[PDB]
Amino acid sequence: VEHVEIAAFENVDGLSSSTFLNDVILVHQGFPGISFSEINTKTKFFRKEISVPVMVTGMTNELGRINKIIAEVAEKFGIPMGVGSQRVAIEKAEARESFAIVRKVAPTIPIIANLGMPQLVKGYGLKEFQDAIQMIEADAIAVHLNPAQEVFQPEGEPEYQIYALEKLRDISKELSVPIIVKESGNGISMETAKLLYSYGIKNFDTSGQGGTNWIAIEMIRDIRRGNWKAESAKNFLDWGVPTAASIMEVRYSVPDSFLVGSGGIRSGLDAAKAIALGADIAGMALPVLKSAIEGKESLEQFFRKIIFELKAAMMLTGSKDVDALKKTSIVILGKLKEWAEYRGINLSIYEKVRKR
Amino acid sequence: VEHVEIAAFENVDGLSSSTFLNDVILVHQGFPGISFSEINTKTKFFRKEISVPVMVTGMTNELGRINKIIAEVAEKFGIPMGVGSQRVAIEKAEARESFAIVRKVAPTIPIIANLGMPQLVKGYGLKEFQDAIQMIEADAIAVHLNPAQEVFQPEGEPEYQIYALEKLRDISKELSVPIIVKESGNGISMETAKLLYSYGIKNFDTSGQGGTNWIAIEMIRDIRRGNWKAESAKNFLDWGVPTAASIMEVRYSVPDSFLVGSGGIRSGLDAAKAIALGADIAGMALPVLKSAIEGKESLEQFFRKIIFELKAAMMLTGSKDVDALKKTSIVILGKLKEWAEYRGINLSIYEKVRKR
Amino acid sequence: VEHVEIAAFENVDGLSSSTFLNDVILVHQGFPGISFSEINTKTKFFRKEISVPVMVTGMTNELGRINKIIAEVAEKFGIPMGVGSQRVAIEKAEARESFAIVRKVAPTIPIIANLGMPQLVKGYGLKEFQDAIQMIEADAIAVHLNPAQEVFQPEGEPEYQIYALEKLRDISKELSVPIIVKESGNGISMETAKLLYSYGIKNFDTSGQGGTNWIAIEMIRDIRRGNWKAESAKNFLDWGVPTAASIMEVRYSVPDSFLVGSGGIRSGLDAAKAIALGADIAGMALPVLKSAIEGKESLEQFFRKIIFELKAAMMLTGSKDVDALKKTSIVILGKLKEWAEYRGINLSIYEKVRKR
Amino acid sequence: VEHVEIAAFENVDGLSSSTFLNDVILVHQGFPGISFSEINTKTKFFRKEISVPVMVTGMTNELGRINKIIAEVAEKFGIPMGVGSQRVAIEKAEARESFAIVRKVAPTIPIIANLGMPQLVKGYGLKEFQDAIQMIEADAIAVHLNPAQEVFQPEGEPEYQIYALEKLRDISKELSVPIIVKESGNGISMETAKLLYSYGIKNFDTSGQGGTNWIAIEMIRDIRRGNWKAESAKNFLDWGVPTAASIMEVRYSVPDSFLVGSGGIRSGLDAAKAIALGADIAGMALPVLKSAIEGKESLEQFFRKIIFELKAAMMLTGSKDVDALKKTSIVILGKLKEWAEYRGINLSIYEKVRKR
Ligand SMILES: Cc1cc2nc3c(=O)[nH]c(=O)nc-3n(C[C@H](O)[C@H](O)[C@H](O)COP(=O)(O)O)c2cc1C
Ligand SMILES: Cc1cc2nc3c(=O)[nH]c(=O)nc-3n(C[C@H](O)[C@H](O)[C@H](O)COP(=O)(O)O)c2cc1C
Ligand SMILES: Cc1cc2nc3c(=O)[nH]c(=O)nc-3n(C[C@H](O)[C@H](O)[C@H](O)COP(=O)(O)O)c2cc1C
Ligand SMILES: Cc1cc2nc3c(=O)[nH]c(=O)nc-3n(C[C@H](O)[C@H](O)[C@H](O)COP(=O)(O)O)c2cc1C
């Protein structure tokens, strides 16, 4: 598919965009108070325990073999996996297999189902959610927001009438698993998290700018068909809430949330920063795709590296476990500091909130 | 004409200058609450409704055909258009046509007459103003300030005594249509807006630095004649109030103003930022000229793009209409923030005023 | 002489240093409320009136012809002129003419004698000071501080003991003309100004970093002799109080001072900024020397250029005279803002002070 | 030895790291109030007086000759010298000489022993400490922290259980000399300083980032071995507390500490800055190694240069002695300013603490 081709092989990772993660420093503790072998990376993911506080977030036959590779490696490492949109599989019986195998190959890890928010204004509802969940015996379902991508694509247009949320709220009352609302690379602001929260959504995946740039992907699609919209997309390459800013806004405005910090997480250090900032876990998509494309051992080496990097940051902050990481001392500098200040985030009360 | 030749084909657009608009961020809303097709870009321009909150601002035989192109396309898109200085048409009856074509080809949109503050200093009075208006059946008249251009031009030297403002006030009480006071690239400060406001001026067009650089144009003219003033002009290339700062200072110092945010507006995103910051409409001149020179179809495509970009910023901020855009969430960072703080602009109270 | 050779023809103007004047913005006024021909640049210099608020500051047969040129042009333009150090003329009768000529060629302007603070640590006293004054019928005497130069020069080491100030205080009591204390490229701090003030010094010339870099001059002298001190000098190239910061410190700590704002003043805009910030007049040395070396007509053109640029800044700020310019609206940003804040300069009470 | 090979000949000094000392400005005093020849650089180092407030910090048969050169030059200049880790000398009776020579060739200066904190959880205790000290007749012992280096090295893992401090605390009551706790290039934070202080540690050596980058050194070791941990070390090159930030944090959090400011000290201006910021003395390692390798006269010239540079900064700040330097006027700007602010270092109570 053209989207996968562009994302994996063109220069669109963080193109003219920023996570603001470089504005976050984890304070080095020269006397850690622990040994490396005592570091415990285990944490809760709803009703299950996972081995490392990171998930693979959703990415849409050839698509099913990447999904297979990702799922088996995720299972091995005890990390949760989101699948990409299950709309095609809801509609076409054939496509059901390229999702199913996930649970054949990953019996124990949390698996998160996926449908787009715009589908809720287009006839999708309780049944479809139940089908997407059943299809992979999912432990949760992610509902994704991608208005920026939809705005810049040749075809169709974004529809996010409030009805979607009213329906989602109804759905949440009969679903057997939790709902996560996630972005797709442009981030969740406090106004959006408060709005979602007001309809009963308590679980968020920031998916901020700085990682996969979908506006850049549509720019490329546009250039490829000589569409003038490409020039317009260029103006919006840096559009969105940066991941680090998104983590703060969501944690601040809904302190009881379960929070995935994703969008440009490219190292275990990035993952450690996201968690220390306020996330409960870090999410990754694009670098998982690129490694899985190289093959199973490449993705295994990828996760070994991400996990080493995470434990390195844990060790060097004297953080024996994830709960300790979430309260370790940080510095916030530069644009992220200015962002937080303008946005009314009292850093003093932020600190308190991130640490509880 | 030399000035048009230099503006169109030399490197004078934003030369060593800045709008400060890069310090303005529109907060992305992942659940916009609207569909793209419900976005309404209509707004008021004095007694008329326009289709988009953007105007072409004034730009001075061959200058009549560019005006004709601009005017038929502005009519098509339902956007207001200011003409360039009518001085030559007051002084020569034969220059009237290159303005009279405007109303034949654009019978319904607001059309804004144009005379200089220099003409008012020099004994233009009511009749000249009435004649400029009648010549194009104008819906208002813009009076331009260009002391910087006058300072640096090979020939002549500016006069801006308060007697001209006494004249303007006298004229305004007998005119059939409102007066807009606009700059020409170097922007309107709070002192200047307040002074004008004390003389009954309520409508402003910021025309701040960052776009067409008239000091740069005169520097080039000076270079061309081997005039030593070109070195002095170079020291002044970054002179003036940046467009974003000017929007802020005028809205802050005259809360009730009708305000055009102009000077370096080059995209529908720039336009959306200017309006969200505090302008009622965005103005553009130079890129409209450059597209009109290419032709009617080039300029039609230019406007479709501006409009698409505007609506994309409204969609992605959850702004269903121009009133909502005016109150959407922003971040102010960097030098603009330092500018505002130094100039006594409480950013807390600024938010209140811009949202009303 | 080697110092003039290096200053005039090597890369030492602003080398790795900064005036901080780029952090000072004069607020553009689109309706100035004055005309260009009514602008009055006349100001006071002790008991004389000068035509422009700028002086040539001191610069050390061939040295007497550059002085002669500078003096005749300064007389022509009505601007005060400091001579360079008169030590050699106190020490040798023959060296007197290369100064004396000054007063033959420049009978009316203020002329400022020059002796070093190192001469006061070394046994110059009243008579030597009187002789320096009489030799050129000076209207004031400058005593220069150059400890950085002395530190890094190949030969010898600085002495700035307190008895030299006791001596200056005593001398000042029997002198017929005022004493100005000036630096030589490294700027005057509030601690230094307050100390000088406690001994009766009322008149200061900032000579801050960002213009002529004397540490760079000595570095080059050191390099030219294979002297290892060159590498040490390199580490101190950005040593000193930037001119803009020095102006603020002296104005704030000695509000009643007469203040020359100098050190890196390279245009009439620089000069206008220095005065707006708090100086009574601006000072220049190096670019005058460079022009003088090309000849009298070149220097005449240089002054015409400086004056035009000063009047342009006055015009475009609506400042009818120097007193108006001193209270015109400014913006302070960036490092200078941070400098001022850290040094306890409340930017609100600073405004009050500079405006009186 | 590989670590010396890499430190001395690869690009690892300040690689992707920063001391933050460029954010510290010493205020120039154009009238110093002292002479160069009167400047007194003597200061206390526990029970001894040293000639200059700088030490050589510890660096680990050809390792002995470098040590012998360093020690004899340090003796000549009256500067204290730390040795590298004595672990091998404890285990191997042959290695004792390459440390003991130090004391034959430097009978009078303070000599500082060295063992690593992780040894305390691996069998080392009072006896090994007494041994280390006796072997070189030490005046103090340094216990080093190098967790970041141990994390990234091919072989092994960092062990810093609290037991190590419990043991160290016991040892401290029976040792005949003081204990200094030092980092090794990644700096000491307030949490770590306060933790050490709670176990009785009063003496600290910041060894902050910006100088020798041990994560970089291990990265190169990993590269050379084809180890994938190299890619992970690259992610951590800028990890740690910058030297200037560490000096502020330790002085702030343990105001009566004896404090060595080290990590990236490369000139006497860096040393002066470190001292004025709040250190008692400055420490250097890498540049001493590099000079020692070139030979005795090179190292002699190096110290001459450092000392001249320190006295230059003392002269130019009007600091007659080390006590005066510690209270001289400074400006803190930029990232260091932001770091201190985030970390709750009230810059006003900081000023008091560092000046007492
Ligand atoms: C090829 C590709 C396909 C994607 N498809 C989906 C999708 O079907 N569902 C969805 O929720 N997110 C989708 N995502 C968005 C990711 O889940 C993630 O939110 C975003 O890429 C930011 O993370 P990253 O920077 O680690 O890639 C897709 C991303 C990629 C790269
Ligand atoms: C070629 C040209 C001619 C102009 N002539 C006029 C004029 O006659 N009247 C006037 O009010 N403004 C004049 N303008 C100023 C514009 O109206 C506008 O204020 C300024 O160029 C800043 O907007 P921009 O950056 O979008 O060009 C002129 C601008 C251009 C480029
Ligand atoms: C070649 C040269 C020689 C100087 N000699 C003197 C001196 O004799 N007396 C003194 O007070 N200042 C001396 N100055 C310092 C200047 O008066 C002035 O303070 C300094 O150069 C900063 O101004 P500028 O950046 O405009 O050069 C000298 C400067 C130059 C360039
Ligand atoms: C080659 C080398 C070996 C080192 N070995 C030791 C060691 O044995 N003990 C120790 O405490 N620190 C050791 N250090 C760290 C230094 O003492 C110092 O803390 C660090 O290098 C930062 O200072 P610098 O940037 O001036 O080198 C070593 C440094 C170098 C360059």
Q: CATH no. for residue A187?
A: 3.20.20.70
Provide the phi-psi class of B125: left if phi over 0, else alpha when psi is between -120 and 50, else beta: beta
How far is Cα C311 from Cα C40, in angstroms, rounded to an integer? 9
- For the four alpha carbons of D315, D319, D322 and D328, in that order, the dihedral sign comes to negative
Q: What H or E segment, with its residue span, contains residue C314?
A: helix C296-315
Q: Cα(C28)–Cα(B245) distance, rounded to whole angstroms?
A: 12
Give the resolution to one decimal, in Å: 2.0
Pairing of the two strands B111-116 and B140-144: parallel
Partner residues linked to D142 by β-bridges: D114, D180
Ligand lying nearest the CA atom of residue C56: 3
| A221 annotated as a binding-site residue | no
Q: How far away is chain B from the Cα of C292, in angstroms, using its nearest Cα?
A: 18
**Sole residue written with tokens 């994309």:** B312
Q: Which residues contact D249 (CB under 8 A, 6 or more apart)?
A: D188, D189, D190, D193, D241, D343, D345
Within 10 angstroms of residue B225's Cβ, the number of other Cβ atoms is 9
Query: Between the CA of residue D320 and those of B124, C154, D323, what are the distances in Å?
Result: 72, 22, 8
Q: What is the 3-state secondary structure (H, E, C) of chain D?
A: CHHHHHHHHCCCECCCCCCCHHHEEECCCCCCECEHHHCECCEEECCEEECCCEEECCCCCHHHHHHHHHHHHHHHHCCCEECCCCHHHHHCHHHHHHHHHHHHHCCCCCEEEEEEHHHHHCCCCHHHHHHHHHHCCCCEEEEECCHHHHHHCCCCCCECECHHHHHHHHHHCCCCCCEEEECCCCCCCHHHHHHHHHCCCCEEECCCECCECHHHHHHHHHHHCCCCHHHHHHHCCCCCCEHHHHHHHHHHHCCCCEEEEECCCCCHHHHHHHHHHCCCEEEECHHHHHHHHHCHHHHHHHHHHHHHHHHHHHHHCCCCEHHHHCCCCEEECHHHHHHHHHCCCCHHHHHHHHCC
Closest CA to D256 of D188, D203, D326: D203
Which amino acid is located at A235 in the chain? Answer: N
| Residues after which a C–N gap over 2.5 Å breaks chain C | 60
Tokens at B93, concatenated:
């009856």
Residue C162's closest chain D neighbor by CA? Answer: D33
Closest CA to B174 of B141, B217, B126: B126
Q: How far apart are CA D184 and CA A30, in angstroms?
A: 9
The answer for residues whose C-beta is within 8 angstroms of residue C131's C-beta and 6 or more apart is C90
Query: How far is residue D230 from each of residues A22, A35, D208, D219, D224, measured CA to CA in Å?
Result: 20, 21, 22, 5, 9
Q: Does B161 touch chain C (CB under 8 A)?
A: yes
Residue C104, CA distances (Å) to C71, C108, C257, C299, D100 in order: 9, 10, 31, 19, 77
User: What is the three-class DSSP state of B236?
Assistant: coil
Range of the domain at C61: 1-356
CB within 8 A of D67, min separation 6: which ones?
Answer: D83, D84, D98, D99, D101, D102
Residue the block writes with tokens 């969105």: A240
CA distance C179 to C202: 8
Q: Which ranges of B135-242 would DSSP assign to H, the alpha helix? A: 147-152, 163-172, 190-198, 214-224, 229-234
Experimental technique for the deposited model: X-ray
D28 touches chain C (CB under 8 A): yes
In chain A, which residues have their Cβ closer than 8 Å to the Cβ of B268?
Answer: 232, 235
B324 touches chain A (CB under 8 A): no
Residues β-bridged to residue B113: B141
Q: How many domains does chain C have?
A: 1
Say yes or no for a CB contact (<8 Å) between D196 and A31: yes
Cβ-contact C289, C236 below 8 angstroms: no
Query: The tokens 């100064």 sit on which residue?
Result: C99
Does residue B65 have a known ligand-binding role? no
Q: Which of A30, A34, A309 sits opposite D145 (nearest CB)?
A: A30
> Looking at chain C from residue 261 to 280, which residues have their Cβ under 8 Å from any Cβ of chain B?
267-269
d(CA B260, CA B278): 9
Q: How far is the CA of D59 from the centre of ligand 4 (A)?
A: 5
Q: Which ligand is nearest to the CA of B286?
A: 2
Q: Please name the residue that has the structure tokens 């994302």.
A: A7
Among A90, A183, A184, which is best to mutate for testing ligand 1, by the most ligand atoms less than 8 A from CB?
A: A184
Pairwise CB contact (< 8 Å): B34 & A228:
no
The verdict on the CB of residue C184 being under 6 Å from ligand 3 is yes
Instruction: List the end-to-end C-alpha distance of chain B, in Å, as a whole number.
Output: 43
Pick the closest to residue D76 from D300, D301, D279, D349 (CA basis): D300
| Distance of residue D35 Cα from the nearest chain C Cα, in angstroms | 4
* Torsion D272-D183-D342-D249 (CA) sign: negative
- Residue C167 is classified by DSSP as H
For residue D77, give both structure tokens: 């200049």
Rounded to whole angstroms, the Cα distance separating B45 from B55 reads 10
| Chains with ≥3 CB–CB distances under 8 Å to D | A, C
What six digits make up the tokens of D132?
């280390």
C255: alpha, beta or left? (left if phi > 0; alpha if psi -120 to 50): alpha
Q: Which residue of C has its CA nearest to B236?
A: C269
Q: Which residue of B has its CA nearest to A196?
A: B31
Touching subunits for chain C (3+ Cβ pairs under 8 A): B, D
